[PDB]
Amino acid sequence: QAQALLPIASYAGLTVSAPVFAALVTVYGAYALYRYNIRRRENSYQRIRSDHDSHSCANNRGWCRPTCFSHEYTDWFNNDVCGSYRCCRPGRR
């Protein structure tokens, strides 16, 4: 996880979260991230650029992701409402 994410064009002119930002810098670099106006934002909630079968859960207080980043955690309750994805509820439980 946090490695080889969505293309830098997927965040073109956006403010990405640290997990994705640092990962992006890991593959695309601050060079490419600067190029596509990819900035780094807060992580007080679920902040990912989706994935595949991703969707809202926990009353849209958690994003359904195949993997949760450091700013969210695997909520197993809404994991059930997600199906295959786990509900990424803000935090690190």
Tab-separated table of N, CA, C and O in Angstrom, residues 3-88:
chain	number	residue	atom	x	y	z
A	3	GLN	N	1.937	3.154	-2.510
A	3	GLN	CA	2.963	2.882	-3.496
A	3	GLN	C	2.304	2.532	-4.820
A	3	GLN	O	1.453	1.644	-4.877
A	4	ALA	N	2.694	3.251	-5.865
A	4	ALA	CA	2.125	3.071	-7.205
A	4	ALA	C	0.603	3.209	-7.173
A	4	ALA	O	-0.129	2.233	-7.340
A	5	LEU	N	0.139	4.430	-6.953
A	5	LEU	CA	-1.287	4.704	-6.809
A	5	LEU	C	-1.869	5.128	-8.146
A	5	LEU	O	-1.331	4.791	-9.202
A	6	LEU	N	-2.988	5.834	-8.090
A	6	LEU	CA	-3.541	6.507	-9.253
A	6	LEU	C	-2.488	7.405	-9.892
A	6	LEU	O	-1.618	7.944	-9.205
A	7	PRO	N	-2.536	7.543	-11.220
A	7	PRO	CA	-1.655	8.443	-11.962
A	7	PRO	C	-1.710	9.872	-11.445
A	7	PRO	O	-2.721	10.313	-10.901
A	8	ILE	N	-0.619	10.601	-11.655
A	8	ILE	CA	-0.520	11.990	-11.217
A	8	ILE	C	-1.571	12.874	-11.882
A	8	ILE	O	-1.846	13.977	-11.417
A	9	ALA	N	-2.158	12.383	-12.965
A	9	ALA	CA	-3.215	13.108	-13.645
A	9	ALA	C	-4.523	12.985	-12.876
A	9	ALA	O	-5.390	13.855	-12.959
A	10	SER	N	-4.660	11.904	-12.117
A	10	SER	CA	-5.853	11.684	-11.309
A	10	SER	C	-5.924	12.676	-10.148
A	10	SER	O	-6.996	12.903	-9.581
A	11	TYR	N	-4.783	13.261	-9.791
A	11	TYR	CA	-4.750	14.282	-8.750
A	11	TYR	C	-4.391	15.640	-9.341
A	11	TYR	O	-4.050	16.565	-8.605
A	12	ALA	N	-4.450	15.749	-10.666
A	12	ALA	CA	-4.053	16.978	-11.347
A	12	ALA	C	-4.877	18.171	-10.871
A	12	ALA	O	-6.047	18.317	-11.226
A	13	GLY	N	-4.252	19.019	-10.069
A	13	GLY	CA	-4.927	20.181	-9.529
A	13	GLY	C	-5.742	19.855	-8.299
A	13	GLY	O	-6.806	20.437	-8.081
A	14	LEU	N	-5.253	18.919	-7.497
A	14	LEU	CA	-5.949	18.517	-6.281
A	14	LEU	C	-5.029	18.584	-5.071
A	14	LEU	O	-3.827	18.827	-5.187
A	15	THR	N	-5.613	18.369	-3.909
A	15	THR	CA	-4.875	18.348	-2.664
A	15	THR	C	-4.986	16.956	-2.044
A	15	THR	O	-6.021	16.601	-1.475
A	16	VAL	N	-3.933	16.169	-2.170
A	16	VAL	CA	-3.960	14.775	-1.748
A	16	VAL	C	-3.508	14.636	-0.306
A	16	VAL	O	-2.878	15.529	0.256
A	17	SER	N	-3.854	13.516	0.287
A	17	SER	CA	-3.524	13.240	1.664
A	17	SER	C	-2.070	12.803	1.798
A	17	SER	O	-1.466	12.394	0.814
A	18	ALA	N	-1.510	12.887	2.997
A	18	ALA	CA	-0.102	12.550	3.203
A	18	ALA	C	0.228	11.124	2.730
A	18	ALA	O	1.195	10.942	1.993
A	19	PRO	N	-0.564	10.094	3.130
A	19	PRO	CA	-0.361	8.712	2.667
A	19	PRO	C	-0.176	8.602	1.153
A	19	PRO	O	0.712	7.899	0.677
A	20	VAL	N	-1.010	9.315	0.405
A	20	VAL	CA	-0.962	9.274	-1.047
A	20	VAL	C	0.120	10.214	-1.567
A	20	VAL	O	0.812	9.900	-2.528
A	21	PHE	N	0.277	11.343	-0.895
A	21	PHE	CA	1.285	12.332	-1.246
A	21	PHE	C	2.687	11.738	-1.154
A	21	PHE	O	3.443	11.753	-2.124
A	22	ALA	N	3.021	11.205	0.017
A	22	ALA	CA	4.341	10.632	0.257
A	22	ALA	C	4.590	9.447	-0.663
A	22	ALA	O	5.715	9.216	-1.109
A	23	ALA	N	3.528	8.710	-0.956
A	23	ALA	CA	3.608	7.567	-1.840
A	23	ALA	C	3.820	8.026	-3.270
A	23	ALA	O	4.617	7.458	-4.006
A	24	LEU	N	3.098	9.068	-3.642
A	24	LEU	CA	3.245	9.707	-4.936
A	24	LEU	C	4.658	10.221	-5.120
A	24	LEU	O	5.270	9.990	-6.143
A	25	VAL	N	5.173	10.924	-4.125
A	25	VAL	CA	6.558	11.387	-4.159
A	25	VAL	C	7.511	10.198	-4.295
A	25	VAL	O	8.595	10.306	-4.867
A	26	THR	N	7.073	9.057	-3.798
A	26	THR	CA	7.862	7.834	-3.854
A	26	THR	C	7.967	7.293	-5.292
A	26	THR	O	8.985	6.712	-5.676
A	27	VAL	N	6.928	7.504	-6.090
A	27	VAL	CA	6.888	6.967	-7.448
A	27	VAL	C	6.985	8.073	-8.509
A	27	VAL	O	7.746	7.962	-9.472
A	28	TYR	N	6.212	9.126	-8.326
A	28	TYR	CA	6.164	10.240	-9.262
A	28	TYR	C	7.144	11.335	-8.853
A	28	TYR	O	7.674	12.064	-9.693
A	29	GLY	N	7.382	11.436	-7.553
A	29	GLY	CA	8.295	12.432	-7.039
A	29	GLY	C	7.609	13.755	-6.790
A	29	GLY	O	6.514	13.999	-7.304
A	30	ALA	N	8.243	14.612	-6.004
A	30	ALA	CA	7.720	15.948	-5.760
A	30	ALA	C	7.752	16.754	-7.052
A	30	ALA	O	6.998	17.704	-7.225
A	31	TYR	N	8.636	16.343	-7.950
A	31	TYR	CA	8.766	16.927	-9.267
A	31	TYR	C	7.464	16.801	-10.055
A	31	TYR	O	6.905	17.799	-10.507
A	32	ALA	N	6.974	15.576	-10.201
A	32	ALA	CA	5.735	15.339	-10.917
A	32	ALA	C	4.546	15.881	-10.134
A	32	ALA	O	3.621	16.444	-10.713
A	33	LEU	N	4.576	15.725	-8.815
A	33	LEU	CA	3.497	16.218	-7.975
A	33	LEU	C	3.394	17.739	-8.031
A	33	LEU	O	2.301	18.297	-7.991
A	34	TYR	N	4.531	18.408	-8.150
A	34	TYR	CA	4.542	19.851	-8.310
A	34	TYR	C	4.000	20.208	-9.683
A	34	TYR	O	3.310	21.212	-9.857
A	35	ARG	N	4.292	19.346	-10.644
A	35	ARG	CA	3.911	19.573	-12.024
A	35	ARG	C	2.405	19.535	-12.208
A	35	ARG	O	1.835	20.358	-12.923
A	36	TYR	N	1.765	18.578	-11.563
A	36	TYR	CA	0.329	18.392	-11.717
A	36	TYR	C	-0.452	19.093	-10.623
A	36	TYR	O	-1.611	18.773	-10.378
A	37	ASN	N	0.200	20.053	-9.974
A	37	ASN	CA	-0.415	20.837	-8.906
A	37	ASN	C	-1.020	19.911	-7.857
A	37	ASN	O	-2.154	20.093	-7.407
A	38	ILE	N	-0.270	18.883	-7.510
A	38	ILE	CA	-0.677	17.955	-6.481
A	38	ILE	C	-0.121	18.398	-5.139
A	38	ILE	O	1.085	18.334	-4.891
A	39	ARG	N	-1.010	18.872	-4.293
A	39	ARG	CA	-0.630	19.408	-2.993
A	39	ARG	C	-0.910	18.389	-1.901
A	39	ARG	O	-1.539	17.366	-2.152
A	40	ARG	N	-0.452	18.678	-0.691
A	40	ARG	CA	-0.686	17.799	0.446
A	40	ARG	C	-1.641	18.460	1.426
A	40	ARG	O	-1.439	19.608	1.827
A	41	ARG	N	-2.676	17.739	1.804
A	41	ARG	CA	-3.697	18.291	2.686
A	41	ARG	C	-3.739	17.576	4.030
A	41	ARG	O	-2.918	16.698	4.308
A	42	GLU	N	-4.711	17.968	4.848
A	42	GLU	CA	-4.965	17.336	6.136
A	42	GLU	C	-5.416	15.889	5.975
A	42	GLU	O	-5.712	15.427	4.870
A	43	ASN	N	-5.472	15.184	7.094
A	43	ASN	CA	-5.875	13.787	7.103
A	43	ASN	C	-6.783	13.513	8.289
A	43	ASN	O	-6.626	12.513	8.989
A	44	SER	N	-7.741	14.396	8.504
A	44	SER	CA	-8.625	14.295	9.656
A	44	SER	C	-9.758	13.308	9.386
A	44	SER	O	-10.549	12.997	10.273
A	45	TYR	N	-9.819	12.807	8.161
A	45	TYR	CA	-10.888	11.910	7.753
A	45	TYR	C	-10.381	10.923	6.704
A	45	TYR	O	-9.172	10.813	6.478
A	46	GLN	N	-11.308	10.220	6.063
A	46	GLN	CA	-10.971	9.284	4.995
A	46	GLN	C	-10.606	10.064	3.734
A	46	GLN	O	-11.426	10.786	3.173
A	47	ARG	N	-9.379	9.937	3.289
A	47	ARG	CA	-8.931	10.720	2.155
A	47	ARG	C	-8.158	9.844	1.183
A	47	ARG	O	-6.942	9.687	1.301
A	48	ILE	N	-8.876	9.254	0.241
A	48	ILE	CA	-8.257	8.466	-0.808
A	48	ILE	C	-8.952	8.755	-2.130
A	48	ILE	O	-10.138	9.085	-2.153
A	49	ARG	N	-8.219	8.622	-3.224
A	49	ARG	CA	-8.766	8.864	-4.553
A	49	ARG	C	-9.464	7.606	-5.073
A	49	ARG	O	-9.207	7.156	-6.192
A	50	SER	N	-10.332	7.036	-4.232
A	50	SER	CA	-11.097	5.841	-4.582
A	50	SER	C	-10.170	4.677	-4.955
A	50	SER	O	-8.986	4.664	-4.596
A	51	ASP	N	-10.737	3.687	-5.634
A	51	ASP	CA	-9.989	2.534	-6.124
A	51	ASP	C	-10.775	1.806	-7.186
A	51	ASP	O	-10.583	2.032	-8.377
A	52	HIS	N	-11.670	0.945	-6.763
A	52	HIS	CA	-12.432	0.167	-7.713
A	52	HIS	C	-13.871	0.019	-7.270
A	52	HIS	O	-14.759	0.703	-7.769
A	53	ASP	N	-14.092	-0.866	-6.321
A	53	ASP	CA	-15.422	-1.084	-5.785
A	53	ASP	C	-15.611	-0.218	-4.555
A	53	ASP	O	-16.346	-0.561	-3.632
A	54	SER	N	-14.905	0.903	-4.545
A	54	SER	CA	-14.955	1.836	-3.442
A	54	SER	C	-16.257	2.629	-3.440
A	54	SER	O	-16.857	2.877	-4.486
A	55	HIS	N	-16.669	3.035	-2.251
A	55	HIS	CA	-17.918	3.764	-2.058
A	55	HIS	C	-17.990	4.303	-0.647
A	55	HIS	O	-17.107	4.044	0.169
A	56	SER	N	-19.031	5.056	-0.367
A	56	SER	CA	-19.230	5.615	0.957
A	56	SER	C	-19.825	4.577	1.907
A	56	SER	O	-20.607	3.721	1.492
A	57	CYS	N	-19.419	4.640	3.166
A	57	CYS	CA	-19.990	3.806	4.211
A	57	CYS	C	-19.940	4.555	5.537
A	57	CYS	O	-19.435	5.681	5.594
A	58	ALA	N	-20.477	3.944	6.592
A	58	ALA	CA	-20.503	4.556	7.919
A	58	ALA	C	-21.221	5.900	7.877
A	58	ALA	O	-20.810	6.853	8.537
A	59	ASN	N	-22.297	5.959	7.090
A	59	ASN	CA	-23.057	7.197	6.876
A	59	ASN	C	-22.172	8.237	6.192
A	59	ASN	O	-22.225	9.425	6.510
A	60	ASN	N	-21.362	7.763	5.246
A	60	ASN	CA	-20.344	8.577	4.579
A	60	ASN	C	-19.432	9.248	5.605
A	60	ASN	O	-19.055	10.414	5.479
A	61	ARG	N	-19.104	8.500	6.643
A	61	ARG	CA	-18.084	8.908	7.590
A	61	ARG	C	-16.890	7.984	7.448
A	61	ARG	O	-15.944	8.034	8.231
A	62	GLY	N	-16.962	7.132	6.437
A	62	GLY	CA	-15.862	6.265	6.087
A	62	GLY	C	-15.905	5.907	4.617
A	62	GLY	O	-16.981	5.690	4.059
A	63	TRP	N	-14.754	5.908	3.973
A	63	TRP	CA	-14.665	5.469	2.586
A	63	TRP	C	-14.289	3.989	2.502
A	63	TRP	O	-13.363	3.534	3.169
A	64	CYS	N	-15.027	3.243	1.690
A	64	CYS	CA	-14.719	1.841	1.437
A	64	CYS	C	-13.487	1.716	0.570
A	64	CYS	O	-13.504	2.103	-0.599
A	65	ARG	N	-12.429	1.174	1.145
A	65	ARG	CA	-11.173	0.995	0.442
A	65	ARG	C	-10.652	-0.420	0.676
A	65	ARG	O	-10.895	-1.009	1.728
A	66	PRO	N	-9.959	-1.001	-0.321
A	66	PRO	CA	-9.370	-2.335	-0.189
A	66	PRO	C	-8.270	-2.357	0.869
A	66	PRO	O	-7.911	-3.410	1.393
A	67	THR	N	-7.749	-1.174	1.171
A	67	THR	CA	-6.722	-1.005	2.185
A	67	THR	C	-6.888	0.362	2.832
A	67	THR	O	-7.237	1.328	2.155
A	68	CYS	N	-6.637	0.442	4.123
A	68	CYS	CA	-6.792	1.693	4.851
A	68	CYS	C	-5.434	2.313	5.147
A	68	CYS	O	-4.476	1.608	5.469
A	69	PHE	N	-5.355	3.629	5.020
A	69	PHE	CA	-4.105	4.348	5.227
A	69	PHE	C	-4.052	4.959	6.626
A	69	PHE	O	-5.051	4.984	7.342
A	70	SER	N	-2.880	5.456	7.004
A	70	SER	CA	-2.665	6.011	8.338
A	70	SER	C	-3.379	7.354	8.497
A	70	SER	O	-2.801	8.411	8.244
A	71	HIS	N	-4.634	7.273	8.943
A	71	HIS	CA	-5.552	8.409	9.075
A	71	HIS	C	-6.964	7.851	9.075
A	71	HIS	O	-7.939	8.552	9.348
A	72	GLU	N	-7.040	6.565	8.757
A	72	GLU	CA	-8.267	5.801	8.823
A	72	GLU	C	-7.930	4.382	9.266
A	72	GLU	O	-6.754	4.017	9.345
A	73	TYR	N	-8.941	3.594	9.566
A	73	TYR	CA	-8.729	2.228	10.006
A	73	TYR	C	-9.823	1.321	9.480
A	73	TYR	O	-10.820	1.788	8.931
A	74	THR	N	-9.636	0.029	9.682
A	74	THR	CA	-10.587	-0.967	9.237
A	74	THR	C	-11.763	-1.067	10.200
A	74	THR	O	-11.682	-1.751	11.222
A	75	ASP	N	-12.842	-0.370	9.890
A	75	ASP	CA	-14.075	-0.539	10.637
A	75	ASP	C	-14.779	-1.786	10.130
A	75	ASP	O	-15.196	-1.846	8.970
A	76	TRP	N	-14.874	-2.784	10.994
A	76	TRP	CA	-15.398	-4.090	10.624
A	76	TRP	C	-16.920	-4.106	10.558
A	76	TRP	O	-17.505	-4.984	9.925
A	77	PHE	N	-17.560	-3.138	11.189
A	77	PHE	CA	-19.011	-3.041	11.133
A	77	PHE	C	-19.449	-2.622	9.735
A	77	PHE	O	-20.223	-3.314	9.062
A	78	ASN	N	-18.926	-1.499	9.286
A	78	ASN	CA	-19.251	-0.995	7.970
A	78	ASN	C	-18.464	-1.748	6.907
A	78	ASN	O	-18.746	-1.644	5.722
A	79	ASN	N	-17.472	-2.514	7.336
A	79	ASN	CA	-16.791	-3.453	6.449
A	79	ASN	C	-17.828	-4.400	5.857
A	79	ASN	O	-17.799	-4.733	4.671
A	80	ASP	N	-18.780	-4.785	6.698
A	80	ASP	CA	-19.873	-5.651	6.290
A	80	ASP	C	-20.756	-4.962	5.250
A	80	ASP	O	-21.184	-5.590	4.280
A	81	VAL	N	-21.016	-3.663	5.435
A	81	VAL	CA	-21.827	-2.915	4.472
A	81	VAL	C	-21.046	-2.648	3.185
A	81	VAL	O	-21.630	-2.360	2.140
A	82	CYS	N	-19.727	-2.735	3.271
A	82	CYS	CA	-18.868	-2.542	2.110
A	82	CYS	C	-18.828	-3.792	1.242
A	82	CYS	O	-18.879	-3.705	0.014
A	83	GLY	N	-18.734	-4.949	1.880
A	83	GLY	CA	-18.702	-6.196	1.146
A	83	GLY	C	-17.317	-6.802	1.115
A	83	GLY	O	-16.961	-7.596	1.987
A	84	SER	N	-16.529	-6.427	0.119
A	84	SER	CA	-15.170	-6.927	0.000
A	84	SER	C	-14.188	-5.907	0.566
A	84	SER	O	-13.172	-6.266	1.164
A	85	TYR	N	-14.492	-4.632	0.369
A	85	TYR	CA	-13.682	-3.562	0.931
A	85	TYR	C	-13.953	-3.401	2.413
A	85	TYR	O	-14.991	-3.820	2.920
A	86	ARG	N	-13.008	-2.794	3.096
A	86	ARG	CA	-13.167	-2.476	4.497
A	86	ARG	C	-13.506	-1.005	4.635
A	86	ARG	O	-13.076	-0.187	3.819
A	87	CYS	N	-14.289	-0.667	5.645
A	87	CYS	CA	-14.701	0.708	5.824
A	87	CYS	C	-13.609	1.491	6.516
A	87	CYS	O	-13.298	1.246	7.683
A	88	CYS	N	-13.021	2.419	5.793
A	88	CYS	CA	-11.937	3.213	6.322
A	88	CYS	C	-12.469	4.397	7.120
A	88	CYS	O	-12.699	5.486	6.590
